[PDB]
Design a protein around this motif. Structure first.
Motif, short mmCIF file in Angstrom:
data_model
loop_
_atom_site.label_atom_id
_atom_site.label_comp_id
_atom_site.label_asym_id
_atom_site.label_seq_id
_atom_site.Cartn_x
_atom_site.Cartn_y
_atom_site.Cartn_z
N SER A 1 10.92 -34.14 0.03
CA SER A 1 10.67 -33.86 -1.37
C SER A 1 10.91 -32.38 -1.68
O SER A 1 10.99 -31.54 -0.78
CB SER A 1 9.24 -34.26 -1.75
OG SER A 1 8.30 -33.61 -0.92
N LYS A 2 11.03 -32.03 -2.91
CA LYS A 2 11.22 -30.74 -3.45
C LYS A 2 9.96 -29.91 -3.36
O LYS A 2 8.86 -30.45 -3.39
CB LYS A 2 11.87 -30.73 -4.76
CG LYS A 2 13.22 -31.16 -4.99
CD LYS A 2 13.84 -31.08 -6.28
CE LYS A 2 15.17 -31.56 -6.52
NZ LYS A 2 15.63 -31.66 -7.79
N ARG A 3 10.05 -28.62 -3.29
CA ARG A 3 9.02 -27.65 -3.21
C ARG A 3 9.37 -26.41 -3.99
O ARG A 3 10.06 -25.54 -3.44
CB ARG A 3 8.58 -27.45 -1.83
CG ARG A 3 8.17 -28.53 -0.97
CD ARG A 3 7.65 -28.32 0.34
NE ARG A 3 7.38 -29.36 1.21
CZ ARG A 3 7.19 -29.41 2.49
NH1 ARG A 3 7.23 -28.37 3.13
NH2 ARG A 3 6.98 -30.47 3.07
N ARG A 4 8.96 -26.25 -5.20
CA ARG A 4 9.17 -25.18 -6.10
C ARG A 4 8.17 -24.08 -5.92
O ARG A 4 6.97 -24.37 -5.90
CB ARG A 4 9.37 -25.61 -7.49
CG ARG A 4 10.38 -26.55 -7.87
CD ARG A 4 10.02 -27.61 -8.76
NE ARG A 4 9.67 -27.30 -10.06
CZ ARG A 4 8.90 -27.87 -10.93
NH1 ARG A 4 8.34 -28.91 -10.62
NH2 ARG A 4 8.70 -27.39 -12.05
N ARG A 5 8.55 -22.85 -5.79
CA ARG A 5 7.75 -21.70 -5.66
C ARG A 5 6.98 -21.40 -6.92
O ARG A 5 7.42 -21.74 -8.02
CB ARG A 5 8.47 -20.54 -5.11
CG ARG A 5 9.12 -20.55 -3.83
CD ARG A 5 9.48 -19.34 -3.16
NE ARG A 5 10.35 -19.30 -2.08
CZ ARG A 5 10.59 -18.40 -1.19
NH1 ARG A 5 9.99 -17.34 -1.24
NH2 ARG A 5 11.41 -18.58 -0.28
N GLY A 6 5.86 -20.76 -6.85
CA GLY A 6 5.05 -20.41 -7.90
C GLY A 6 4.52 -21.50 -8.74
O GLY A 6 4.54 -21.45 -9.97
N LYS B 1 -2.62 -23.95 -4.32
CA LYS B 1 -2.85 -25.01 -3.41
C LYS B 1 -1.61 -25.72 -2.93
O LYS B 1 -1.68 -26.53 -2.01
CB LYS B 1 -3.92 -25.92 -3.86
CG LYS B 1 -5.16 -25.38 -4.34
CD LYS B 1 -5.97 -24.64 -3.42
CE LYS B 1 -7.30 -24.22 -3.74
NZ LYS B 1 -8.09 -23.64 -2.80
N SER B 2 -0.48 -25.50 -3.52
CA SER B 2 0.77 -26.07 -3.22
C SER B 2 1.24 -25.67 -1.84
O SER B 2 0.86 -24.62 -1.33
CB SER B 2 1.80 -25.82 -4.21
OG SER B 2 2.22 -24.54 -4.21
N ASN B 3 2.11 -26.49 -1.24
CA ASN B 3 2.67 -26.22 0.08
C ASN B 3 3.95 -25.41 0.01
O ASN B 3 4.77 -25.48 0.94
CB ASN B 3 2.91 -27.54 0.82
CG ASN B 3 3.94 -28.41 0.13
OD1 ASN B 3 4.28 -28.20 -1.04
ND2 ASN B 3 4.45 -29.41 0.85
N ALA B 4 4.21 -24.65 -1.00
CA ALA B 4 5.31 -23.80 -1.21
C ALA B 4 5.26 -22.60 -0.29
O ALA B 4 4.24 -22.34 0.35
CB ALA B 4 5.54 -23.45 -2.57
N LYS B 5 6.28 -21.81 -0.21
CA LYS B 5 6.41 -20.63 0.54
C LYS B 5 5.57 -19.51 -0.04
O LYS B 5 4.99 -19.65 -1.12
CB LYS B 5 7.81 -20.28 0.84
CG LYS B 5 8.66 -21.09 1.66
CD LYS B 5 9.85 -20.57 2.28
CE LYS B 5 10.58 -21.30 3.27
NZ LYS B 5 11.34 -20.65 4.18
N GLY B 6 5.48 -18.39 0.59
CA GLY B 6 4.81 -17.29 0.13
C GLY B 6 5.28 -16.69 -1.13
O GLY B 6 6.48 -16.73 -1.41
N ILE B 7 4.44 -16.16 -1.95
CA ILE B 7 4.65 -15.60 -3.23
C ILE B 7 4.19 -14.17 -3.35
O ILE B 7 4.70 -13.37 -4.15
CB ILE B 7 4.16 -16.42 -4.39
CG1 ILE B 7 4.95 -16.25 -5.62
CG2 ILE B 7 2.76 -16.25 -4.56
CD1 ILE B 7 6.16 -16.89 -5.78
#
Length: 52
Positions: free
Chosen positions: A9-14, A18-24
């Motif tokens: 699945s897709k993973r949008r930053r910001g 709690k999301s499993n996205a990359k660091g911001i």
RNA sequence: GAUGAUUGUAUAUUAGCGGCUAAAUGUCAAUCAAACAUGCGAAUUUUAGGUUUUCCAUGAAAUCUAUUUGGAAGAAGAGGCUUGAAAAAA
């Protein structure tokens, strides 16, 4: 019609904390804000001469 | 100040890589040591602001060389992680 296997699945930053996205935070705080993230080169080594 | 580098008026000239200046960086359309308008000439930032739903697993550093070495960890390399275990009656 099915793939018989789970699809990535897709993973949008910001998008929420709690999301499993990359660091911001790291990207903003502890990083060079120059639109290049460094010299516009390919053989840069930090002052010292390149390997070649 | 007011008989004199007096005052005042129609229509005119000098245009920014400039002109004006009885010379102050004073003035050129009411914050000019370099005016205003437009730009597919599509503006750059080691500073700095923001960055949006949940649950779970795992889980840091503030150390080193180099950069004529800095300071409010900039960039590059190295170092640091999932290895093991821990279930018993003559």
């Amino acid at each position: 019609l099915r793939l018989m296997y789970k699809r990535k699945s897709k993973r949008r930053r910001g998008r929420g904390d709690k999301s499993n996205a990359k660091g911001i935070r790291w990207k903003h705080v502890h990083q060079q804000a120059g639109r290049y993230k460094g010299p516009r080169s390919r053989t840069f080594e930090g002052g010292k001469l390149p390997l070649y």
